[PDB]
Design a protein around this ligand. Structure first.
Ligand SMILES: Nc1ncnc2c1ncn2[C@@H]1O[C@H](COP(=O)(O)OP(=O)(O)OP(=O)(O)O)[C@@H](O)[C@H]1O
Ligand SMILES: Nc1ncnc2c1ncn2[C@@H]1O[C@H](COP(=O)(O)OP(=O)(O)O)[C@@H](O)[C@H]1O
Ligand SMILES: Nc1ncnc2c1ncn2[C@@H]1O[C@H](COP(=O)(O)OP(=O)(O)O)[C@@H](O)[C@H]1O
Ligand SMILES: [Mg+2]
Ligand SMILES: [Mg+2]
Ligand SMILES: [Mg+2]
Lengths: 470, 485, 47, 27, 470, 134, 170, 134
């Protein structure tokens, strides 16, 4: 029943609206407070306090609100324009364009809240995605149509890692893509939006390929908590109605959980551990289960996850581990050495590390690399106290190999041309399999350990060895 | 009788005033009591209004009539505020006459969107050789100054303000930069001494100081960064370049914790309210470089976060580090080692500063930072890994000279033409012969004689700023002439 | 015969350092449980 | 701090592993 | 306005008084409850609770109060007598002399609550104050007309440090002084009061120089949280109306902050961090900002600041460092080694350690001493485990010098004749500087560490070395 | 999620009463405690350590005690329970671990240090014990 | 070993350490048989919040060792409050078994033994009851009534002129 | 337990007012602050360090301050106090000890390290000190 309701109280980002009897809007609805121009205020029904009073969460700033103003009920959740006309547009959580390039062409509309697919319609996909990074497509290969997570704290190389995966996959992948930004820097969206206009993914002359739905960190916590549900609706429309394999890069998914904690306090909830909300796993589960591959279409998602203060025991990233098919933990200690990407070669795991998916060859190659790096990490004390002279003849060679491996794990990304000046290098998947065996066997146990820094492939390590020797 | 534009006070206590009436008041609307004390209405409750005080609660009784202002909290902006010491509200306190106002901009302004922004390329030389070479800052960038107690956080920000004096003499607008210093929680004597220090170098007449001392009410300490940002946002929207230093945000969150906990707002982690991250998120995001169609101006924000025992894992700093475009960590342990400023290069990093760094320095600083990236590893172990190996000992006599060369006395910004010769003598390792006791004096007059020797070698950088292959043949001719001194 | 005197004292001075760093860990854990529960009790009993 | 205590414990507790296994080796 | 109200409720040290309409006393006013014969019971309005009722804080014990007793309004804050007649007297928090030598005669009467000096009349005096202490006049030189703080846990010697500056500076300083005892031992004032009448500062048969105010640990929270505002009001009358340089010794200023936490629970405040009150930086700022050198006169304050459980991250000391021009941190581990004073040379700082104040000659030594003392305590792990013999050839010589400096920093105080027996020692500022140049260099490097223990300069080291050589 | 271990036990309790054998694996109880804690803090029930309610131990106690070896008088069946606890950095001193460990008849600790070493499954032999494993 | 190094206090409190699988249940069954034949007093074993299996295995291990015979008269009484009982029960079971020991002390005049296993789950059960009543938890989430609830059990265990109660608490 | 030190002080305070000499031994104040914290947390008063209320220092402050030597005008009687504080692992940097130490006129420390060694009473001479004992 579309009608009118009046404001009873406005506290921060939480506004309660008083309605008349038998006109009460349902929960998770959209309420509009009319400001004369566009981009008017929207409210999200959260609770039914009783006495025909509803407690909502603001989707924008609450300054200027006056108690008593009329509030319209759309009788439906925040419905966004979905379809192939959303490609190459910059849209907010409300479903409105902010690139001032005109209205959004679409026909069918879908709400942002929807029940996740049932257990009977789940699809089991064990398919490897060829990324182009050596350490990625070896130890922890990514799963196409799955959920990939990037971890580590602030300054370990999470956003740059995403801008690298866009350059490699968004053109090799045939289906469309949706890049939703949850509570991140605005300039990083602009620095990424320009690359979209030059990569060929986004063009103003021809119809683009990717959709950009950004909810920056300057927007109130009511917008950051539901903006991930907006970009997800666009991906599901390409999965259910278009039947295409879709890429869903999320950055950052931690802000979705954080924004739920900034509102839960004002909504009168007893704070859980580390000041988090009681609805921790459920609110995350109500978003991570919708991002899955069904039998109609497939949705691949690379979700960067911020780790507060490099603490993996924090409740926010620890709950994300159970939802992901492949994890890529970025350690800060690896970044301090100058090794990029700072992918932890032992903590980064994958579900596709099986002989039934890639074979016995790949599984055995990655097994000896970790055992080598674990044996090398087991001798960290001796090398720093007893030197290199006081070691057995067997683990000495492994130490000489592990130093070459972990320096060969570093790869100059295509986006890392401004950080190192080194031109970006891209390798295939099976080229890395034979490249590491020639390092594990001893075929290339004569090349220096400094010739593996910032090189792609084994045939390029020798090319640098001839120049440095002269 | 009328309770739509006025209202009587129900209770006033510790800066919190619950007023009955004000039926048509806006959220965050400035009000005026009958005793001259201002205030804004944060939480509009049902039947009462929660108003914080911009002053003292001594002059307000129960039943005091409260007039409205009919406007969200706005602050005066413009070029007529350059060289004035003001409070958080905008009222002058330096005593040098009233404030002539061009226009007014709200204190709570949403940060500009994606499209009106552009990639940062304009440099912002702080004057510090350890900063501009290792952690360059672009115009519209967010470079955090995080450190422990009394490690040089405030003095680094002053060196950036004092350095921008050589660009306010000319006429080029693309190189102009007006500074803003927002004192939050400090004492009256410190800020007043800081003003005279900026008036001792003619750095006041282009900088605006927003003073929110410790004696003032917590709403004033909370609003001072936002009002200071809006006063620097005027330059951004009009094509000019601006710089604002938040000193500091670690004490602003303490004031915001008072307004929340005294308005009965539910606390969160570490007694701080839930939206303590949104307090800083919408603040630093208002600093960016905009399109030429939107003016082409830029506002750069330098936030300061005081840690506790180097604890970078505390609540407040972890939020700020996640917002800024990098941080400059100041470790108190490296301050006594001699390294001043005590910049722990192993943790401080800039992101979009590499393409904003000066081309004349990027030609010599791109590799320079990675020499210390190796040196911190080898120099930390020369007696623990007790193996007297002269194989890779060359890095030890190389880094100890350049890390000692990165020293810089307080309030001494070195120009771009004054830093490029020193770096080239450090990256090549051509000053390893001089001991560690005369190198600090070698630099003292290695810059001064170059002016008298070749004053036409600094006028080119003052116009071009780029050193080509021709000067590389000259730098080699300049180097060998003064190696015996 | 003097390495042991530099490796035996390096074991009794390490054990004298483990104890002082085992009590401190129990103190810090005891401080985390309280200063986090107090932070919850404050937020919970605020209503 | 708390984060480094257990980290500093694992170092000292495993330094005890080295020195105690160098008193009998020298014997 | 002068009316009369009645007491409604009494909780702890907080008493609520109910008035009629239009007769409500303003905040920070003074109320009076008449015991009659013992004395008078004073209250202070803290907040308006509404319903014609105010909430006050009792300046004495609330034991014996009965609901219904009438209270009179003085229409003014706690007014105290100020002027020349206060010199040589002992006053409580209310303004009544507790030295039972007769009433204090004065003409002007100022309230204890007053607005702090504005930004206009702020002074920027960066002048050095010679103390005679080697650790002070070298590493962290005090600023005359500034603010000095003494930290450290219980038992390190914060109170002992003060009475030395009272015996050394206050006599050479011709101006007046004020010592307001805030929440400390009563005997420490009694055993000090006799020392002031024998030194010459206080003479009951003549004219004195110092004023004594005391609110001790036997006083309820209302008196322990307002006694610092009484002794400071007197110092501002000597500064802004007589224009004299005044010394303000505070001990202990932590009790002012602490007592506010014992009543904040009863004033209805949500407890802040570590059980403290939200109004912590403001209530402290409304007292530490009144202590500043104005254009009229100058006030030099040396405040002892207690540190709860050796925790400098505690909210009480952490907000105090910002109000101090020079800090002198005392450490507990230093006092366990026998080094007195236990001034931590790596945490005590000052704003006068610049070349614009003392020059390059003093700054070079202070910057060289702190670098040597840092190199010794940064290698403390290797020394405590592997022993001193497992070091380099230079890092074993630096340790030798640092152990000499660390003990040469120790200095016998004038009051330390009862705990050590050694005569009092006062070392000049320039005499201390050159004494470290003859220790950092190759001079006097043959003398042991016991020759620098409890010594005043090298001129007394050789005097001990003369006994050592025989 | 809070009712699943109980309804799963009762479905596996039918085999125990009829003299048959049954096996049940709770995967996992560490994510069940956060579910009960979520509904308890919203039901205005006073929290305890780590926001977990007071009857958080009575939750896992009456759940695992239902697994036992029955006498031949009642069929002679047996219900075996295999609970799973996801710790945080090997923290065996946390609340939920302390609850379950103090109830179960021994535990099989899995340390990730031996998993990267190659030994899979990484079974910490040194401290993993079984009480009635004799 | 007991009567030489760490002698037991008549009417006092003895803390029993050691994990399970080292021989703790046998040590208790020995004290039941010894004191009943050395001094002539009965023993009381109270199971404070322990497993039901351990209660069944101990009850069956007592009927084969001789301390309990159903065809005759036993020596020790058993009071078991398992883990499947709510925190209210597990916080009063120690007060239940102690009462029986006070009957043999005051009315029968004997030296009684009170075995508590475990005593830590007597405190933990009190903390869960405290959390249900809503009282603000003290340090490390314990009860404000921690020294009193513990004292309400120990102070009742002492020596009188009529008898005495010795308590061995794990 | 909270009132016993105050009344016992008042019982020994009669000798102090009548020009006599009295001595009182608090054994111990460490367990008194536990009883005071009990009635404090049951009175809904907010906790602080180690869950103790903010006025836990004012509890002992006004207690020990009643023990001193009076002037010659009021007889000259004196009351000496011997408070006792139990630590945990030799933690002198704890809350309650730092409060009592900041009240008492010195302390006599007793480290258990020298106690089992044989030195009894194990008086840590390097940490025990009297102030007005000159
Ligand atoms: N680059 C430098 N070279 C030499 N001295 C410095 C330098 N930076 C700071 N100092 C000195 O260190 C002292 C402390 O610095 P500063 O005042 O910046 O501390 P801070 O970081 O602001 O910490 P706080 O705000 O707690 O005082 C100053 O007195 C200054 O003289
Ligand atoms: N592939 C890379 N090569 C070189 N440097 C990198 C790389 N990735 C990240 N960095 C460095 O790390 C810093 C921060 O990385 P960023 O992607 O912002 O991490 P996050 O987004 O997780 O905070 C940047 O300043 C950059 O210099
Ligand atoms: N400068 C000093 N020289 C010698 N002894 C000292 C010094 N300062 C403190 N002490 C010793 O410390 C003890 C108590 O110090 P005190 O100043 O009372 O601590 P607090 O500052 O906590 O009151 C005294 O007994 C005294 O012997
Ligand atoms: Mg990022
Ligand atoms: Mg500063
Ligand atoms: Mg003292």
């Amino acid at each position: 029943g579309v009608g009118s309701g009046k404001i009873r109280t406005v506290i921060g980002a939480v506004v309660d609206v008083q309605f008349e009897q038998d006109n009460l809007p349902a929960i998770l609805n959209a309420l509009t407070i009319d400001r004369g121009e566009g981009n008017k205020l929207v409210l999200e029904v959260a609770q039914h306090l009783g006495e025909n009073t509803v407690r909502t969460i603001a989707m924008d700033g609450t300054e200027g609100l006056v108690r008593g103003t009329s509030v319209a009920d759309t009788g439906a959740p925040i419905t966004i324009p979905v379809g192939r006309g959303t490609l190459g547009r910059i849209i907010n959580v409300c479903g409105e364009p902010i690139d001032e390039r005109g209205p959004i062409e679409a026909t069918k509309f879908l709400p942002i809240h929807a029940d996740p697919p049932t257990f009977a319609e789940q699809s089991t996909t064990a398919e490897v995605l060829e990324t182009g990074i050596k350490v990625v497509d070896l130890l922890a290969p990514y799963a196409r149509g799955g959920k990939i997570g990037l971890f580590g704290g602030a300054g370990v190389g999470k956003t740059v890692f995403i801008q690298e995966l866009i350059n490699n996959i968004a053109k090799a992948h045939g289906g469309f893509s949706v890049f939703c930004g949850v509570g991140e820097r605005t300039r990083e969206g602009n620095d990424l939006y320009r690359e979209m206009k030059e990569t060929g993914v986004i063009n103003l002359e021809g119809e683009s390929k990717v959709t950009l739905v950004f909810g920056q960190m300057n927007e109130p916590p009511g917008a950051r908590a539901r903006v991930a549900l907006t970009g997800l609706t666009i991906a599901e429309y390409f999965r259910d109605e278009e039947g295409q394999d879709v890429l869903l890069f999320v950055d950052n998914i931690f802000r979705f959980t954080q924004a739920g904690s900034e509102v839960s306090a004002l909504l009168g909830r007893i704070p859980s551990a580390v000041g988090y909300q009681p609805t921790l796993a459920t609110d995350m589960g109500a978003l991570q289960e919708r991002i899955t591959t069904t039998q109609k279409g497939s949705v691949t998602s690379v979700q960067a996850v911020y780790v507060p203060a490099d603490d993996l025991t924090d409740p926010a990233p620890a709950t994300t581990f159970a939802h992901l098919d492949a994890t890529t933990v970025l350690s800060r200690g690896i970044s301090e050495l100058g090794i990029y990407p700072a992918v932890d070669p032992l903590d980064s795991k994958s579900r596709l590390l099986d002989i039934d998916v890639v074979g016995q060859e790949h599984y055995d190659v990655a097994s000896n690399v970790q055992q080598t790096l674990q044996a090398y990490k087991s001798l960290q004390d001796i090398i720093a106290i007893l030197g290199m002279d006081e070691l057995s003849e067997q683990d000495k060679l492994t130490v000489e190999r592990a130093r070459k491996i972990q320096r060969f794990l570093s790869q100059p990304f295509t986006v890392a041309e401004v950080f190192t000046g080194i031109e970006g290098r891209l390798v295939s998947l099976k080229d890395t399999v034979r490249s590491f065996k020639e390092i594990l066997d001893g075929k290339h146990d004569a090349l220096p350990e400094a010739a593996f820094y910032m090189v792609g492939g084994i045939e390029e390590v020798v090319a640098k060895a001839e120049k440095l020797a002269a | 009788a009328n309770l739509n534009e006025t209202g009587r006070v129900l209770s006033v206590g510790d800066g919190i005033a619950r007023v009955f009436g004000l039926n048509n008041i806006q959220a965050e609307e400035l009000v005026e009591f009958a005793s001259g004390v201002k205030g804004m209405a944060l939480n509009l409750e049902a039947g009462q209004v929660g108003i914080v005080l911009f002053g003292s609660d001594r002059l307000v009784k129960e039943g005091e009539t409260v007039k409205r202002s009919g406007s969200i909290v706005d602050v005066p902006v413009g070029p007529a505020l350059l060289g004035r010491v003001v409070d958080a509200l905008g009222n002058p306190i330096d005593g040098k006459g009233p404030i002539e106002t061009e226009f007014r901009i709200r204190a709570q302004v949403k940060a500009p969107g994606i499209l009106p922004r552009t990639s940062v390329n304009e440099p912002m030389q702080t004057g510090l050789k350890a900063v501009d070479a290792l952690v360059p800052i672009g115009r519209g960038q967010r470079e955090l100054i995080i450190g422990d107690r009394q490690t040089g956080k405030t003095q680094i920000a002053i060196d950036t303000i004092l350095n921008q004096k050589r660009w306010n003499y000319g006429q080029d607008e693309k190189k102009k930069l007006y500074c803003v210093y927002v004192a939050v929680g400090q004492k009256r004597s410190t800020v007043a001494q800081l003003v005279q220090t900026l008036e001792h170098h003619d750095a006041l007449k282009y900088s605006i100081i927003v003073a929110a001392t410790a004696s003032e009410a917590a709403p004033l300490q909370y609003l001072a960064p936002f009002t200071g940002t809006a006063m620097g946002e005027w330059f951004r929207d009009n094509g000019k370049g601006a710089l604002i230093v938040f000193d500091d945000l670690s004490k602003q969150a303490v004031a915001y914790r008072q307004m929340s906990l005294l308005l009965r707002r539910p606390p969160g982690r570490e007694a701080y309210p839930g939206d303590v991250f949104y307090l800083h998120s919408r603040l630093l995001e208002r600093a960016a470089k905009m399109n030429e169609r939107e003016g082409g101006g830029s506002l750069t924000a330098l936030p300061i976060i005081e840690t506790q025992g180097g604890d970078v894992s505390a609540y407040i700093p972890t939020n700020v580090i996640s917002i800024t475009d990098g941080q400059i960590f100041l470790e108190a342990e490296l301050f006594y080692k001699g390294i001043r400023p005590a910049i722990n290069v192993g943790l401080s990093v800039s992101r979009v500063g590499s393409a904003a760094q000066v081309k004349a320095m990027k030609q010599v600083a791109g590799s320079l930072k990675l020499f210390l990236a190796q040196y911190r590893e080898v120099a930390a172990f020369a007696q623990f890994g007790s193996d007297l190996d002269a194989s890779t000992k060359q890095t030890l006599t190389r880094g100890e000279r350049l890390t000692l060369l990165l020293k810089q006395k307080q309030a001494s910004p070195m120009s771009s033409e004054e830093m490029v010769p020193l770096i080239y003598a450090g990256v090549n390792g051509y000053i390893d012969n001089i001991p560690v006791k005369q190198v600090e004096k070698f630099e003292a007059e290695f810059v001064s004689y170059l002016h008298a020797n070749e004053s036409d070698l600094l006028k080119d950088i003052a116009a071009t700023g780029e050193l080509s292959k021709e000067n590389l043949e000259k730098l080699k001719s300049i180097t060998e002439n003064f190696v015996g001194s | 015969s003097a390495r042991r005197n530099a490796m035996d004292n390096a074991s009794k001075n390490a054990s004298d350092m483990i104890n002082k760093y085992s009590i401190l860990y129990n103190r810090t854990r005891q401080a985390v449980i309280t200063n986090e529960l107090v932070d919850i009790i404050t937020g919970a009993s605020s209503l | 701090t708390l984060r480094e205590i257990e980290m500093r414990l694992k170092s000292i507790k495993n330094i005890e592993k080295i020195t105690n296994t160098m008193k009998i080796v020298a014997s």
